[PDB]
Amino acid sequence: DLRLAITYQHYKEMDARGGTRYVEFTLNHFGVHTADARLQRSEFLGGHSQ
Amino acid sequence: EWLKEDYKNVDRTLALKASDNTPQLRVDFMFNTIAEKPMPLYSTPGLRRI
Amino acid sequence: ARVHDFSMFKGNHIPRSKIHIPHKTIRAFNVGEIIPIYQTPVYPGEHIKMDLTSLYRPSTFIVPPMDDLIVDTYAFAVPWRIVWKDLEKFFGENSDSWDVKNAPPVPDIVAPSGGWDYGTLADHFGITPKVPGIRVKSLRFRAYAKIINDWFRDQNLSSECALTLDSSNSQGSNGSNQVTDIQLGGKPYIANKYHDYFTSCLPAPQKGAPTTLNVGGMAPDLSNATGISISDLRLAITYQHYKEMDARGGTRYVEFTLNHFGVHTADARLQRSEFLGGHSQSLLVQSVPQTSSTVEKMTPQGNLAAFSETMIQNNYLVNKTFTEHSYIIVLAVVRYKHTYQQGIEADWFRGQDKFDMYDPLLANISEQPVKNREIMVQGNSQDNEIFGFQEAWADLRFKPNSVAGVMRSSHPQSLDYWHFADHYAQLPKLSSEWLKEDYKNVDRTLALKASDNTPQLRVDFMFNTIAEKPMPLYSTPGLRRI
Amino acid sequence: KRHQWRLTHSARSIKRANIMPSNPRGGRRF
Amino acid sequence: KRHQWRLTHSARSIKRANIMPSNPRGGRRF
Amino acid sequence: KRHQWRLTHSARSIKRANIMPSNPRGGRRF
């Protein structure tokens, strides 16, 4: 029961750092880049800052 | 008391005096430090040893 | 682009010369005593170069002993400033403006009634014993205690020697108290015995109170009572790691910095006395056969006695330059390695179940208690009580030195005059008194005992220093400037 | 190989050494 | 070295950059 | 290195020397 509790705390802390959007979940938990269009998100084209 | 610097000699040359409670100087300071510190790169909860 | 900003005159020109200073002193003392054998004042900018030759003559031995005596010699630099707070005020550094008005003189220590005794610290500093009514500057007695506190004290089992930094005078003492009387010039400080299995034990598994997880006692079947978070658990584990790190490495601030941050901090930055040099060597033992005939109720022809004569050379004992007013103190102590005849090794008690036996999985558990039965076994309830704490499974890394048979001290006809092994009248406790070296174990091997007031050691010390000092070659009256 | 001096008293030999400041178990002590 | 434009207003300079999607602390926000 | 003669009595050694007339502090005396 102690090992379960420690993993639950690791899980919720990982969710707090990285964000819980499904595109964010996949990168933090499995280390995977998932395409925005696969997930039905608007696509970022380009940008500049000055 | 005499050996201390005196802001009143500069003050008669200024259009707005400090005797009128206008500060003589307005300064912008930008610090850039490189610190090599005895800390982990990111501090992420959970311990290596028990 | 350039204007006139005041600068240094570069001052006067300071003379400089090299001086050979020979020195010879003859001493007698016992085993375990830390004895000042040298002292000198050092003015700023001197470079000191010191060689020492020593000749040790212990008391003659009944037989050649199956044990060794070891000499350690130590050199230190103590700034007057860390011993006395008014040093800067003394040379004229003023809290107020302009010159200092009333600067206190260097403090005095006054002799005890009837003077100091023989064998005291004042005796070996070169203060003449048994001369009442004399007073002397106290900064070197303070300097001695400072070196004990910085180096020789065991911070776990004892408090530090009393050290006064003020300008008030002090009252000398003949007492043997190892805390209060050291700066008062009394009996010398007794070195602690070398690190081994038993001398390395600690009072507790950590330095602090043992870390526990919280338990609430509230009752209204009990409602509420909450629990413990994973966050409170992480804090507790780090507190235990912290106190265990403090126990292993020592909590002096020079020690704290190395264990916690992995950093070497200089002794002079931290206001500690500076270690200059040191050497360690065992003593020679020459055995003498008996060439006289066997006489009834005497030793037989062919019996072996011994004497001990050893010449030790210390070159470069001190090599350095000094940037401030300071004292050089050189120390000597004789110690031996210890052997234990009254305990039983911890492995004879293992085997209640399989978790008593070593396993790689139990490699990283908490410090485990060393039982009293290991140091002295009495066959009573105290055997399973705790003497001290050691790292887990350390008895598998150590096998304490031992004695068996007629060699051991408790035998009615005992051969223990062949060795130095410990003998205990009662169960020893882990404490300051037990951790000190003991001259009585060596004393039963000697033809003339120190209990009979024969010193165990007679030593001749010859010092040769090359001093490059800020003095003229010869000091001849008359001045260059008016 | 066999004959030796009047200098043998024990099985264990001790080697001379320069002393250095060290940090043994429980803090510095000499 | 000394004289400079009518363009100095602060000690800190900011460099132009291409924007990329990133994952800072707490999720994506621009 | 260790063993030495029946000739060791003190830490200090004294070197043999030719005597010359000298002028130490306070005049000549031998």
Side-chain angles (χ1 to χ4, degrees), chain C residues 249-306:
Chain C
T251 323
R252 290 185 178 90
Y253 186 69
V254 62
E255 296 167 349
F256 179 88
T257 293
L258 179 65
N259 298 135
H260 289 269
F261 296 88
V263 175
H264 294 288
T265 303
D267 291 338
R269 177 181 288 273
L270 297 178
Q271 285 184 324
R272 301 180 71 245
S273 59
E274 295 175 352
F275 173 77
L276 301 182
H279 179 67
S280 182
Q281 183 169 349
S282 66
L283 299 177
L284 295 176
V285 178
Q286 296 85 359
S287 61
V288 181
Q290 176 174 343
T291 63
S292 64
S293 65
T294 298
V295 176
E296 187 269 338
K297 296 292 181 64
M298 299 291 287
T299 54
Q301 185 184 351
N303 189 40
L304 296 179

Side-chain angles (χ1 to χ4, degrees), chain C residues 57-78:
Chain C
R57 294 188 183 279
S59 296
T60 186
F61 293 101
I62 299 166
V63 298
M66 280 172 159
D67 224 326
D68 285 337
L69 292 176
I70 303 164
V71 174
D72 286 345
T73 190
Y74 296 89
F76 294 93
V78 179

